[PDB]
């Protein structure tokens, strides 16, 4: 595969994986962040923990990672290793065990137009303050709250990611064939909110 | 695969040969001499799908 | 960013003196400050750079200190070549430069010789004075008794390259016609070697 | 300037940390090791690992490190990270858990005239066999030993650290002002051979 | 060794572009940062942008919108283009090579700097007109003439830089006929 | 962001991180740091051991790591990887059984005056005497010991950002209640060396 | 009287508050003993300070007779 | 300490680890490779997997790391991270749960001759047909394909 070797060596010349692509010098990356839940593994109340296999939906731009199509074989996308591009440090900030990253820093999707998507798979054990009044017939309200850890909001802006149809599907998506269900808790309500800021930072819960 | 998908790799089974025919692999492989039983469960079936 | 304040704006002094000149930001410059020398019509020359730092190849002669707030460039003896404008200039928050401060021959005073020239029938009226020393001096004039005029401009020579001396010119608008609009006029200018104004008038006459 | 750039490249620019400071090969390193105990964590019967947090005080020349304090600006001491320096690579050979190493790598200290002391701490759960005739008014002869894991007797030698009194320190070493006993093991003694 | 000429046309028209052109000698653009900066006509000098070893640029954030700075490895060329010309744009421009440690850059050296002046004013050569008498002394006076320099003779002299009246040079000369010339001559003589 | 990345090309060219971020080594460099606690994750009575979660903001000047604004078209801030800098060597001196130094090595928020900020994640495993004689209803005075490791107050100074821990993101724990805490900087002095 | 006082940064001579006028000095060991010998405290008091069983006091009444161990009093 | 770094920057210059150590590649690499045991950890009989604290020394001959010792002022041996050389790949074959290959990867001990000896720690959790008949005056014959 000549010209996609000729392309990633001509996209990468120069290229700094560790600044953030805003190409004037007040600009803001706009980060989509969605969220699949694969697996909910277990609540535990005596520690207070939620487990869930989670895939991240992250989607932003990097007017870098542009180029012409029709100039490069007619290669209308890229498929580039997570860690040789700038990646938005979108971590749970919420987490019990102290584990920040994703489990498996998979390739990342380059569009011709430097739109890039990203969709790490996820462990995470994030604390759930737990209703004991009403155990074991409770219900909980377990909260995953995902910021990026150094960069500002007005450096980094999160956003909820669309719907398939474009509009504002605020919710974890659950691949309804494909889920494992637990067999001791149901799933009612999956929203997502973005949190504004009240070094103010912003947060997709 | 989480890096390649359908358009950029192709997952099948492995084919064997025996008689200069070919077959699919449709099962897991087990050593019928050097598998160890397990304590507590038996194998009934073991197939493979892509 | 960094406002840059130099003083003193002319200094006068006499070959093998020390002098010393001062800079002074608005702000913090943490001893990023660098100081030029440029000649009159010629390509400037850096000779100093973080405060202390001598360029190579200029002398030792000169010589940088300061902290903070406030920095001096030092010459140890005056050398008769090193007669020019000195600029300091900070480089760690935009780049802004001092005024820039003129060093200058030391010598006696003179008086300046004043003189006036009522607008000849080819025409303006001038006045001018020469050779005086310093160059600082201050001048006047008035017509029909009402001081100063239309068009008041000046324009004063450089430093005479052996005397040392200065000279000045002044001019009004006052044309060969306009020279109606008085029947006389005068001139007068002030210098350290006349206190009293030396002055020079004329009548409806020349 | 920094003068420490300066001692810095002038002893590290031409240095080898794979061969061991020695002018001939038959040339023994003499290792200075001391052992200070900060607390006993706890000592597991069931599974017979003792668990203990130590700080492993090394010292040792090295000629190639050698620098004196009024060729650069009077600096007496330069901090490195040790892997930039050799090392004797001591570890603890009875460990269960198969962590031989020590839990961080502090900077060495290369101090002039070409000493270089190292004081990393390390976490250490050693094989600890119970007697449990008496139990539970049973005491128990934990021990840790210590080795180099890459060198033999004849390129790296043990010595125990001197005390600033001028005797060796042939025990562990506890701060008794610091130290707290553990909830359930109080310590007799701690030779060390 | 280390030297650099700046060159450039000296008489601009107002709203034209400047195209200024600075040449190096001595050292490659590759290895050295050069910027230009500019004197204004009774001003202290300000910084104008920088072209880097690398071959970017970066411009003063008050001009960002007005400049261009390009560079010719091959040549030691480097020019600066400016467009949107006023009469605030006169003065004295100058090429500097930089000199930096770590990210922080000065100014090591300069060129000789190009006069540059903008006026709608064409050409002309000066009217002259003796100093009517008010040891002993004569003078000529002139007005109405662009662009200098312009050359003065006398058959202890003393001449005075060339003063905008509206826009427009004048000129006095003192030390009898004063012989005048002017490139884009005359005569005047003092009398009773 | 090409400003951006010629200013880190410019800045690590010919960095060293391992001589002291001064301008003269006779210098002591200042290190501003402020524990913010978390979480309270666990206190085991049996072990002696409480675990929590926290944040070690650091703060200190690099003489190296300045630059003009106006020479990267005005970038005031930059976010680089904190593995490059010379950092503070931390160390929790009380650590029962967990990491004694930073390990989750974030970035750096580095400011064009050279004024660094650290805030890495971190698990504290402290180990404090446990007094079990009011159990259950017993109050237990616990801490953790901060220092530089290898660094001693001649060549780096450590000072507390405030006299108290930053508990404005403290999760509210459902077992404990902090009534009071502080952070108090000590100076020993040993007899071997008085400097 | 004036005593050593190791409350400042470095050790200085400071005169006695009213009511105390005893200089004491007192040292005993910890973890950084394998180099750095004992540590050092030193101040003013009205009585001779209690002493530890593993910490050693010194008291005295002269005129800098508290000074760090490796200068001369 | 110089004669060292020279013999190390000579060998390596244009060293290759993929490469198997022979001067013939129809030649066979020769590994002699030798268990000790340091203790028996446990035996997990519901699991069936005995976990063992090893040693497995290994050594064969490298023919490409020869060297005369008159050449180096007769330094006959040398040590050099195992990371470098080419190594044979052992892997405990009935591994349970455990590491399947040598994760500890200490020096070796490189002679003048070529020949490599290297005592790499592991710990071995092997898979046991534990026989539980007559619990608890059992015995069982474990055992570790390598
Ligand atoms: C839970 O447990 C923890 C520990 O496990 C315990 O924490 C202790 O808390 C108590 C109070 O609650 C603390 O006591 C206070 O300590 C203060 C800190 O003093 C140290 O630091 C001083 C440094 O500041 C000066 O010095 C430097 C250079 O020296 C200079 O640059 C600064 O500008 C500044 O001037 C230093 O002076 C002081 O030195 C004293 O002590 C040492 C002995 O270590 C001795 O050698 C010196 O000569 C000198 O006496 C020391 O290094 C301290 O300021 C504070 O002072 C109060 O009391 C004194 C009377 O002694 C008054 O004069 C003063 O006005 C104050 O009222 C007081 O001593 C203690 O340090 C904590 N210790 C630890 C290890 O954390 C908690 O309390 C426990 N919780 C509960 C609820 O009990
Ligand atoms: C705690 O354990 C250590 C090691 O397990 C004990 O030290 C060891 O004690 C044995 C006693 O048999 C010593 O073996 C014999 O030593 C003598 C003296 O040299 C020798 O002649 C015999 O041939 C034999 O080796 C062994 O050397 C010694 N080891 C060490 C390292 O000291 C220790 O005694 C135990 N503690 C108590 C209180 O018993
Ligand atoms: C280590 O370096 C020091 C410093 O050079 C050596 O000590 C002496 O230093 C003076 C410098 O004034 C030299 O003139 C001497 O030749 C040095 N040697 C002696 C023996 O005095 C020191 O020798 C070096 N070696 C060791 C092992 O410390």
């Known amino acids: 595969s000549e010209a996609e070797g000729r392309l990633r060596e001509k996209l990468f010349s120069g290229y700094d994986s560790s600044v953030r692509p805003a190409r004037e010098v007040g600009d803001r990356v706009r980060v989509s962040v969605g969220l699949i839940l694969a697996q909910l593994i277990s609540l535990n109340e005596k520690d207070e923990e939620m487990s869930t296999k989670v895939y991240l939906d992250l989607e932003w731009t990097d007017y870098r990672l542009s180029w012409d199509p029709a100039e490069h074989d007619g290669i209308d996308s890229l498929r580039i290793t997570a860690e040789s591009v700038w990646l938005p440090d979108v971590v749970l900030l919420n987490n019990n065990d102290g584990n920040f990253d994703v489990a498996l820093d998979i390739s990342v999707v380059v569009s011709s137009d430097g739109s890039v998507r990203w969709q790490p798979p996820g462990i995470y054990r994030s604390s759930c303050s737990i209703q004991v009044t009403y155990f074991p017939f409770d219900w909980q309200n377990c909260t995953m709250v995902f910021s990026s850890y150094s960069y500002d909001s007005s450096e980094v802006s999160l956003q909820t990611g669309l719907g398939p149809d474009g509009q504002g599907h605020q919710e974890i998506h659950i691949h309804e064939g494909t889920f494992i269900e637990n067999g001791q808790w149901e799933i009612i309500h999956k929203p997502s909110r973005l949190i504004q800021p009240p070094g103010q930072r912003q947060e997709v819960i | 695969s989480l890096k390649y998908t359908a358009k950029e790799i192709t997952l099948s089974l492995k084919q064997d040969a025996k008689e200069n025919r070919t077959y699919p692999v449709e099962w897991i492989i087990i050593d019928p001499e050097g598998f160890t039983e397990n304590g507590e469960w038996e194998i009934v079936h073991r197939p493979a799908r892509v | 960013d960094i406002v840059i304040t130099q003083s003193p704006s002319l200094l006068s002094a006499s070959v093998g003196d020390r002098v010393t000149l001062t800079c002074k930001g608005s702000?913090?410059?943490?001893?990023?400050l660098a100081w030029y020398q440029q000649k009159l019509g010629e390509a400037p020359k850096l000779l100093i750079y973080?405060?202390?730092s001598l360029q190579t190849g200029i002398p030792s002669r000169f010589s940088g200190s300061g902290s903070g707030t406030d920095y001096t460039l030092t010459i140890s003896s005056l050398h008769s070549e090193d007669l020019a404008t000195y600029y300091c200039?900070?480089?760690?928050?935009?780049?802004?430069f001092g005024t820039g401060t003129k060093l200058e021959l030391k010598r006696a005073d003179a008086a300046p010789t004043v003189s006036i020239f009522p607008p000849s029938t080819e025409q303006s009226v001038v006045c001018l004075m020469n050779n005086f020393y310093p160059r600082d001096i201050s001048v006047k004039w008035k017509i029909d008794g009402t001081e100063r005029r239309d068009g008041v401009l000046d324009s004063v020579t450089d430093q005479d390259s052996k005397d040392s001396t200065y000279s000045m010119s002044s001019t009004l608008s006052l044309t060969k016609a306009d020279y109606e609009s008085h029947n006389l006029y005068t001139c007068e200018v002030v210098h350290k070697t006349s206190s009293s104004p030396v002055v020079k008038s004329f009548n409806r006459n020349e | 300037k920094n003068e420490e750039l300066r001692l810095y490249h002038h002893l590290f620019n031409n240095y080898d940390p794979g061969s061991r400071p020695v002018r001939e090969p038959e040339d023994t390193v003499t290792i200075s090791l001391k052992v200070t105990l900060t607390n006993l964590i706890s000592l597991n019967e069931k599974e017979e690992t003792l668990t203990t947090s130590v700080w492993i005080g090394i010292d040792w020349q090295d000629y190639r490190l050698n620098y004196s304090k009024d060729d650069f600006g009077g600096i007496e001491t330069l901090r490195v990270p040790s892997e930039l320096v050799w090392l004797p690579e001591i570890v603890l050979e009875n460990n269960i858990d198969g962590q031989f190493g020590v839990a961080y790598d502090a900077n060495v200290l290369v101090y002039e005239g070409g000493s270089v002391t190292w004081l990393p701490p390390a976490i250490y759960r050693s094989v600890c066999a119970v007697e449990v005739t008496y139990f539970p008014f049973d005491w128990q002869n934990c021990s840790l030993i210590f080795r180099s894991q890459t060198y033999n007797a004849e390129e790296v030698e043990f010595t125990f650290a001197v005390d600033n009194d001028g005797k060796t320190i042939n025990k562990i070493d506890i701060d008794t002002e610091a130290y707290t006993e553990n909830g359930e093991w109080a310590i007799d003694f701690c030779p060390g051979v | 060794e280390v030297q650099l000429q700046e060159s450039g046309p000296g008489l601009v028209q107002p709203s034209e572009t400047l195209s200024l052109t600075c040449t190096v000698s001595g050292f490659s653009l590759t290895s050295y940062s050069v910027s230009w900066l500019r004197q204004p006509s009774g001003k202290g000098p300000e910084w104008m942008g920088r072209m880097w070893d690398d071959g970017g640029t970066v411009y003063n954030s008050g001009l960002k919108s007005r400049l261009s700075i390009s560079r010719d490895t091959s040549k030691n060329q480097v020019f600066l283009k400016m467009n949107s010309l006023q009469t605030d744009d006169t003065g004295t421009y100058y090429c500097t090579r930089d000199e930096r440690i770590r990210a922080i850059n000065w100014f090591a050296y300069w060129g000789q700097g190009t006069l540059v002046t903008v006026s709608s004013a064409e050409t002309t050569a000066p009217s002259v007109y003796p100093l009517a008498p008010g040891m002993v002394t004569l003078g000529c006076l002139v007005k109405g003439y662009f662009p200098e320099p312009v050359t003065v003779t006398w058959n202890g002299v003393h001449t005075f830089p060339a003063v905008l009246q509206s826009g427009l040079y004048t000129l006095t000369s003192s030390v009898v006929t004063c012989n005048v010339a002017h490139p884009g001559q005359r005569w005047t003589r003092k009398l009773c | 962001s090409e400003h951006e990345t010629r200013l880190v090309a410019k800045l690590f060219k010919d960095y060293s991180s391992v001589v002291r971020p001064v301008e003269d080594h006779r210098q002591v460099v200042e290190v501003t740091v402020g524990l913010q606690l978390i979480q309270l994750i666990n206190v085991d009575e049996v072990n002696q051991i409480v675990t929590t979660n926290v944040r070690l903001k650091q703060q200190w000047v690099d003489y190296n790591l300045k630059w003009n604004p106006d020479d990267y078209g005005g970038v005031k801030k930059i976010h680089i990887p904190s593995e490059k800098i010379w950092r503070p060597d931390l160390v929790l001196y009380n650590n029962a059984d967990g990491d004694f130094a930073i390990v989750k090595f974030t970035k750096v928020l580095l400011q064009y005056t050279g004024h660094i900020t650290w805030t890495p994640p971190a698990i504290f495993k402290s180990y404090c005497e446990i007094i079990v004689t009011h159990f259950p209803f017993d109050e237990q005075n616990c801490s953790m010991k901060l220092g530089t490791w290898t660094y001693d107050g001649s060549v780096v100074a450590i000072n507390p950002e405030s006299d108290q821990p930053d508990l404005s993101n403290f999760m509210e724990s459902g077992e404990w209640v902090i009534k009071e805490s502080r952070g108090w900087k000590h100076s020993v002095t040993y007899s071997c060396c008085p400097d | 009287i004036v005593c050593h006082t190791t409350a400042t940064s470095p050790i200085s001579a400071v005169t006695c508050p009213p009511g105390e006028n005893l200089c004491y000095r007192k040292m005993w060991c910890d973890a950084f003993c394998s180099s750095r010998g004992k540590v050092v405290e030193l101040g003013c008091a009205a009585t001779c300070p209690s002493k530890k069983p593993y910490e050693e006091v010194t008291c005295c009444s002269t005129d800098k007779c508290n000074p760090h161990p490796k200068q001369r009093p | 300490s110089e004669h060292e770094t020279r013999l190390v920057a000579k060998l390596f210059k244009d060293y290759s680890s993929v490469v198997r150590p022979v001067e013939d590649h129809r030649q066979v690499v020769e590994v002699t490779v030798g268990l000790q045991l340091i203790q028996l950890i446990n035996v997990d009989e519901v699991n069936q997997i005995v976990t063992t604290n090893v040693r497995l020394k290994q050594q064969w001959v490298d023919y490409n790391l020869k060297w005369n010792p008159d050449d180096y002022g007769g330094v006959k041996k040398i040590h050099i991270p195992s990371e470098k050389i080419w190594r044979p790949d052992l892997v405990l074959y009935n591994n349970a749960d455990g590491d399947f290959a040598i994760v500890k990867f200490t020096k070796v001990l490189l002679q003048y001759t070529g020949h490599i000896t290297w005592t790499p720690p592991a710990i071995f959790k092997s898979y046991c047909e534990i026989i539980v008949t007559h619990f608890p005056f059992d015995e069982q014959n474990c055992s570790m394909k390598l």
């Open positions: 200039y900070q480089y760690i928050n935009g780049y802004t």
């Open positions: 702000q913090n410059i943490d001893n990023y």
């Open positions: 973080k405060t202390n």
